[PDB]
Amino acid sequence: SMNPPPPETSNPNKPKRQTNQLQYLLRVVLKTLWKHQFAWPFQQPVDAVKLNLPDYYKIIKTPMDMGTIKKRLENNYYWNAQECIQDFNTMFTNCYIYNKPGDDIVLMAEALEKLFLQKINELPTEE
Numbered sequence: 208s209m210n211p212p213p214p215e216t217s218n219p220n221k222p223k224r225q226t227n228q229l230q231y232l233l234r235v236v237l238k239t240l241w242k243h244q245f246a247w248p249f250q251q252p253v254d255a256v257k258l259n260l261p262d263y264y265k266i267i268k269t270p271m272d273m274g275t276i277k278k279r280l281e282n283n284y285y286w287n288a289q290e291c292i293q294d295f296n297t298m299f300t301n302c303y304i305y306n307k308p309g310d311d312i313v314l315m316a317e318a319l320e321k322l323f324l325q326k327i328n329e330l331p332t333e334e
């Protein structure tokens with residue numbers, strides 16, 4: 208079973224902002240998770256063909272990954288920080304839904320989520 212089209216990262220009909228909170232989500236949150244040793248499974252959409260996971264997109268109907276989030280941040284796709292924070296939480300939740308407890312990938316997501324939570328605890332006040 209094929210891969211679906213990726214989540215959109217560009218939509219000229221969609222109103223956009225560049226807020227200090229969104230700048231923090233790129234410069235601090237995304238950057239911190241992206242450079243982590245466990246980032247690599249999350250740096251692009253799940254490739255169900257290459258990974259031989261024909262049921263992945265039968266189970267996961269709202270896919271999200273840090274490659275998509277990175278493009279959305281660099282492209283100023285978002286209106287507010289909460290949209291981006293939701294994308295990160297979707298990515299983690301999908302991993303916990305699809306995979307079994309204790310799997311390596313779940314430990315990887317948990318380590319990235321710990322750092323995510325630490326960083327968004329210091330999300331700056333909106334200017």
Ligand SMILES: CC(=O)N1C=CS[C@H](c2cccs2)CC1
Nearest residue numbers: 248253258260302305306311312
């Ligand atoms: C991110 C995710 O939920 N995937 C689903 C199944 S397998 C793959 C890996 C397992 C261990 C290292 S990568 C990552 C893609």
